[PDB]
Design a protein around this ligand. Structure first.
Ligand SMILES: COc1cc(-c2cncc(-c3ccc(C4CCN(C)CC4)cc3)c2C)cc(OC)c1OC
Ligand SMILES: COc1cc(-c2cncc(-c3ccc(C4CCN(C)CC4)cc3)c2C)cc(OC)c1OC
Ligand SMILES: COc1cc(-c2cncc(-c3ccc(C4CCN(C)CC4)cc3)c2C)cc(OC)c1OC
Ligand SMILES: O=C(O)[C@H]1CCSC1
Ligand SMILES: O=C(O)[C@H]1CCSC1
Length: 285
């Protein structure tokens, strides 16, 4: 039989230190093709090893299609996934505001994806921690739900080696994280989840008011904040993202402020679990 492997790369939709992401076409169908830099080859190996161990399939996890290694004169490393034309949550929040139903649908879908990663199923799948959760690593689907992307730093029950500094938990910044305990990595994801919840909630309209899109800690650290910049804010001063007064006039944003506080405790073991966040979100509105 013919094995059709040609992908037409149509347009570059992302460029960074990691390499590039392209919208591509395979057999009439849109795919996303991540082309890894030599700098970030370990992310391709980790994601590939994870998918070789467990073929994750979940509506709120970016859908795997293929991992390709091709010999050149160098080695070319591609990861091929489903394509989400609306782009990342980061991209989407810049222009778009949200109503109550759209805000809740986004954050419950992220909680659903994250709980699916975290849970060991004994049938099944090992427990997985993401280790780089942020709004750029979440894609928006046409049905209003999101999916979690980029398992290049994921751990299974370290890696390329640290996550995005702006989203690092206090125990990562102060180097107290108990690195031999798998639950430690789940708790780091919950911290980052809380920051994403804050980024989304700001864009939910209430009483004719909305906040502009800002990244977590926009008001206390520079662009491309250093490790030290983040440690001083999060660990030494114990600062947390601001909850605007206008949220306390809206029952949904009041409930979301309480949830994000319960993701941001200095004590990692005090933070809510992804399953408890899902349950809380299903009872809001
Ligand atoms: C190698 O490389 C790539 C391959 C493909 C691809 C193209 N056509 C058909 C296939 C296919 C799938 C599954 C079977 C089964 C049939 C039942 N039998 C009992 C076991 C085997 C055969 C063939 C594939 C996997 C796409 C790619 O990109 C999207 C590839 O990557 C470049
Ligand atoms: C990698 O990705 C894609 C692959 C394909 C594709 C192409 N040829 C054959 C297959 C296939 C056929 C049959 C089996 C099974 C059937 C039951 N039992 C006998 C074991 C073997 C598996 C695989 C597929 C899945 C299509 C896709 O999209 C339409 C893909 O997505 C881009
Ligand atoms: C995060 O991680 C990965 C993401 C993807 C991915 C999948 N669907 C769609 C996208 C996308 C499409 C389009 C835009 C637009 C936004 C508006 N404007 C700025 C021009 C461009 C942004 C994003 C991406 C980037 C694939 C991946 O691997 C193949 C990823 O890595 C695992
Ligand atoms: O790039 C790396 O360091 C990884 C390759 C496979 S295992 C370690
Ligand atoms: O086990 C889980 O939590 C996943 C099943 C479908 S939704 C999440």
């Amino acid at each position: 039989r013919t094995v059709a492997r040609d992908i037409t790369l149509l347009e570059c939709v992302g460029k960074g230190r990691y390499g590039e992401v392209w919208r591509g076409s395979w057999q009439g169908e849109n795919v996303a093709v991540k082309i890894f830099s030599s700098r970030d080859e370990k992310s391709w190996f980790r994601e590939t090893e994870l998918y070789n161990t467990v073929m994750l399939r979940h509506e709120n996890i970016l859908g795997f299609i293929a991992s390709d290694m091709t010999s050149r004169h160098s080695t070319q490393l591609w990861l091929i996934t489903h394509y989400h034309e609306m782009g990342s949550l980061y991209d989407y929040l810049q222009l778009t505001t949200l109503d109550t139903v759209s805000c809740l649908r986004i954050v419950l879908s992220i909680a659903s994806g994250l709980a699916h990663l975290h849970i060991e199923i004994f049938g099944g799948k090992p427990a997985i921690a993401h280790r780089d959760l942020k709004s750029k690593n979440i894609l928006v689907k046409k049905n209003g739900q999101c999916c979690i992307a980029d398992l290049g730093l994921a751990v299974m029950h370290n890696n390329p080696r640290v996550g995005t500094k702006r989203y690092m938990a206090p125990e990562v910044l102060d180097e107290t994280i108990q690195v031999d305990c798998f639950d430690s990595y789940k708790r780091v994801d919950i911290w980052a989840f809380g920051l994403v919840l804050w980024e989304v909630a700001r864009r939910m309209v209430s009483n004719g008011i909305v906040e502009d899109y800002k990244p977590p800690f926009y008001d206390v650290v520079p662009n491309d904040p250093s490790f030290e910049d983040m440690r001083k804010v999060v660990c030494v001063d114990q600062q947390r993202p601001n909850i605007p007064n206008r949220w306390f006039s809206d029952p949904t944003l009041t409930s979301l402020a309480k949830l994000m506080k319960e993701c941001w405790y200095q004590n990692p073991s005090a933070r809510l679990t992804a399953l408890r966040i899902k349950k809380t979100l299903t009872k809001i509105d």
